[PDB]
Amino acid sequence: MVGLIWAQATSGVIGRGGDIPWRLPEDQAHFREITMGHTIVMGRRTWDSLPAKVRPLPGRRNVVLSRQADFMASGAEVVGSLEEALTSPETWVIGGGQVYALALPYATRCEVTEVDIGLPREAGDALAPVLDETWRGETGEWRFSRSGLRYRLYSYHRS
Numbered sequence: 001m002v003g004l005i006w007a008q009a010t011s012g013v014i015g016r017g018g019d020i021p022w023r024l025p026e027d028q029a030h031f032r033e034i035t036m037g038h039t040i041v042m043g044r045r046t047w048d049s050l051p052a053k054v055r056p057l058p059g060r061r062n063v064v065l066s067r068q069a070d071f072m073a074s075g076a077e078v079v080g081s082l083e084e085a086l087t088s089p090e091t092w093v094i095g096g097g098q099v100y101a102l103a104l105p106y107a108t109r110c111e112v113t114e115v116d117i118g119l120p121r122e123a124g125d126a127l128a129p130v131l132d133e134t135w136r137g138e139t140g141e142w143r144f145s146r147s148g149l150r151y152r153l154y155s156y157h158r159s
């Protein structure tokens, strides 16, 4: 099982300036629950976005995808191809935009947090991947984050 997990604005923006223009504590707990115990695969830029005191994320096989053969990610594995990282029963791709696109052929689940924030796409933004007709979606109710933004969870899946 390869799954993708991400939060996006209604516009599809997931990242800007190397970070994320919101923060939902409820989404971070949801992320931790879904990924805990499993492999997490991330692009090098997303590894960079994590503070050093946070990496690796605890209780998970942290895998960083990079083309630099000497890139050092302390506490993590660095692989040069996505296929290298798929040696566990559950693998969650945690971003960012480039790695979601690379991983989507392998994926049968997307746990998507839609954040009710009006955020026009700008040059250089990272974007959510486009899900084609093979994906079946189930939606939750709109909920209020304590940060003041509404959000809702979509669970997409396909055989």
Ligand SMILES: NC(=O)c1ccc[n+]([C@@H]2O[C@H](COP(=O)([O-])OP(=O)(O)OC[C@H]3O[C@@H](n4cnc5c(N)ncnc54)[C@H](OP(=O)(O)O)[C@@H]3O)[C@@H](O)[C@H]2O)c1
Binding pocket: 005, 006, 007, 008, 013, 014, 015, 016, 017, 018, 019, 020, 042, 043, 044, 045, 046, 047, 049, 065, 066, 067, 068, 071, 079, 080, 081, 082, 094, 095, 096, 097, 098, 099, 100, 102, 126
């Ligand atoms: N909203 C969310 O839920 C969420 C979650 C995660 C990240 N984000 C945001 O997304 C943004 C980063 O996403 P990004 O698309 O800019 O970069 P990214 O996907 O996180 O990492 C890009 C890097 O991955 C490596 N890479 C990409 N394709 C590869 C391949 N085919 N083989 C080997 N290595 C490969 C390269 O690393 P080298 O350059 O080292 O080769 C590339 O520079 C940040 O803003 C981050 O905050 C958002």
Ligand SMILES: O=C(O)CCC(=O)c1ccc2c(c1)OCCCO2
Binding pocket: 027, 028, 029, 031, 032, 046, 050, 054, 057, 058, 094, 095
């Ligand atoms: O998982 C934990 O241990 C606590 C929450 C956390 O560390 C976290 C939550 C969301 C993330 C993230 C980390 O980095 C990946 C890119 C953005 O999505």
Ligand SMILES: [Co+2]
Binding pocket: 033, 034, 035, 036, 037, 038, 090
């Ligand atoms: Co689990």
